[PDB]
Amino acid sequence: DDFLSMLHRIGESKALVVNIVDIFDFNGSFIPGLPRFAADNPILLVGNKADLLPRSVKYPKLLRWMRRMAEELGLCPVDVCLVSAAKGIGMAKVMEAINRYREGGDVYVVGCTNVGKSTFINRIIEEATGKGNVITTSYFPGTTLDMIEIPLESGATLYDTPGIINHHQMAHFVDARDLKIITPKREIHPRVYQLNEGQTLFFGGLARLDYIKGGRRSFVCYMANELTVHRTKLEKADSLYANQLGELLSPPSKRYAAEFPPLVPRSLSVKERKTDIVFSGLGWVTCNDPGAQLVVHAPKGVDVFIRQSLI
Numbered sequence: 001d002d003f004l005s006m007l008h009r010i011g012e013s014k015a016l017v018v019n020i021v022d023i024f025d026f027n028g029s030f031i032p033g034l035p036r037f038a039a040d041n042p043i044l045l046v047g048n049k050a051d052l053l054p055r056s057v058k059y060p061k062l063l064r065w066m067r068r069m070a071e072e073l074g075l076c077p078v079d080v081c082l083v084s085a086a087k088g089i090g091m092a093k094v095m096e097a098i099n100r101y102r103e104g105g106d107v108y109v110v111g112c113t114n115v116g117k118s119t120f121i122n123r124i125i126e127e128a129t130g131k132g133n134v135i136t137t138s139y140f141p142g143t144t145l146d147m148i149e150i151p152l153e154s155g156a157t158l159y160d161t162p163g164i165i166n167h168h169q170m171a172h173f174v175d176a177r178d179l180k181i182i183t184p185k186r187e188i189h190p191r192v193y194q195l196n197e198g199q200t201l202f203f204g205g206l207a208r209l210d211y212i213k214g215g216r217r218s219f220v221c222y223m224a225n226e227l228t229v230h231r232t233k234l235e236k237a238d239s240l241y242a243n244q245l246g247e248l249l250s251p252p253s254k255r256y257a258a259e260f261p262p263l264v265p266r267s268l269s270v271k272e273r274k275t276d277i278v279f280s281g282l283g284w285v286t287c288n289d290p291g292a293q294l295v296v297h298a299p300k301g302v303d304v305f306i307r308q309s310l311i
């Protein structure tokens with residue numbers, strides 16, 4: 001309930017809210033309680049990890065997709081930015097945007113864990129320090145909640161809010177060791193798979209895609225290249241998953257195959273051309289033709305859905 005008092009207090013201020021989310025796991029970056037408490041606050045939506053994006057991705061598409069993805073969740077951002085907190089790409093633009101939309105007031109940086117908030121905030125801390133400012137760590141009116149105060153010119157202050165607010169993203173179902181693998185080191189390379197009806201693709205042991213009906217088709221997989229992919233006929237998919245989970249089908253490692261949540265199936269009918277079958281926290285597979293009939297599996301809570309291709 002400390003996060004609530006915090007969310008309520010920043011709501012009173014009417015100050016600019018910088019909400020940073022992971023573009024590969026937007027659903028796992030949503031903060032249900034944000035627009036409920038921040039209706040009057042102008043919010044800047046920042047999509048981190050843009051450096052892992054395949055060069056074939058068109059920014060305007062992603063831009064419009066995330067605004068639309070946010071719009072759908074009661075969250076109506078004043079603007080949207082794409083940055084790579086790790087590579088410093090797009091950081092200059094996001095700073096100009098922050099100075100513009102805050103006008104003269106403060107700014108609160110909000111976001112769930114594993115989104116890149118600390119890396120993003122570290123770049124600001126480094127710049128502010130180079131300008132002679134003093135950065136302070138203290139308590140946001142709650143207690144357990146640590147906050148970082150970063151002085152902006154003339155009285156105003158940028159505040160880093162508890163990076164916490166963990167939720168139900170793919171990252172939380174994987175232990176530290178295998179999370180490294182799910183996490184890409186560099187830009188994502190396409191992997192083309194020509195599938196026939198009655199075939200299945202396992203992405204590690206984390207998610208599954210069944211090609212139910214539709215004729216020979218090319219699926220282009222866009223996920224962490226360390227993530228091993230396995231293909232088998234639909235009719236043996238369940239038997240394989242029961243015996244190879246933790247072994248051939250990993251992550252998850254055999255260690256915590258007694259933690260791994262059941263994969264929940266969902267039916268999907270691809271009616272439009274050039275679409276992305278999005279697997280939250282993992283990436284997506286692109287179907288360049290319509291008609292596809294599929295069944296997708298992923299842990300409960302992690303969203304799998306289709307959108308107009310970003311490619």
Ligand SMILES: Nc1nc2c(ncn2[C@@H]2O[C@H](COP(=O)(O)OP(=O)(O)O)[C@@H](O)[C@H]2O)c(=O)[nH]1
Pocket residue numbers: 048049050051052083084085086087111112113114115116117118119120163184185
């Ligand atoms: N590829 C890439 N990785 C990033 C980026 N920003 C953060 N990360 C990763 O996110 C991890 C840190 O997350 P932090 O620990 O920054 O997340 P936070 O605790 O919610 O603030 C690091 O291990 C980075 O590898 C980015 O812009 N690009």
